[PDB]
């Protein structure tokens with residue numbers, strides 16, 4: 140039941156521990172990239188960036204953008220997306236980190252570099268996907 144990409148999901152009052160964000164969709168055939176951008180105004184608190192061709196390898200890049208400057212990248216070779224295939228990304232907000240799971244398997248955690256979780260009020264979803272659903276609940 141598509142939404143059009145790029146898609147902005149409002150996070151009113153920011154994020155809080157025990158908040159679970161669920162993204163359903165399908166990777167396009169011959170995808171180059173996916174990006175989730177958790178934004179505090181112009182800053183990017185948490186950038187989650189699967190790259191399907193970085194020097195002919197698949198890698199997940201996580202980072203934070205402060206005052207338009209990217210910080211130190213945390214990379215992950217474990218790559219559970221496939222071109223043409225449906226996925227579920229779950230982002231669980233915990234007190235000290237974002238926890239990410241894809242297709243019900245734990246993938247990575249990302250320690251909070253931005254401390255004002257209550258100001259992370261937008262999630263940008265972009266890249267080579269068909270978007271079915273983006274929602275949140277409290278667990």
Ligand SMILES: OC[C@H]1O[C@@H]([Se][Se][C@@H]2O[C@H](CO)[C@H](O)[C@H](O)[C@H]2O)[C@H](O)[C@@H](O)[C@H]1O
Nearest residue numbers: 172186188190200201202203209210211212
């Ligand atoms: O992936 C596609 C793009 O990637 C950036 Se990589 Se530089 C920078 O890195 C940040 C993470 O530290 C963010 O992922 C930015 O979006 C990216 O532009 C490079 O300029 C090119 O390869 C371009 O084609």
Ligand SMILES: [Cl-]
Nearest residue numbers: 252253254255
């Ligand atoms: Cl902060």
Ligand SMILES: [Mg+2]
Nearest residue numbers: 221222223224
């Ligand atoms: Mg295939």
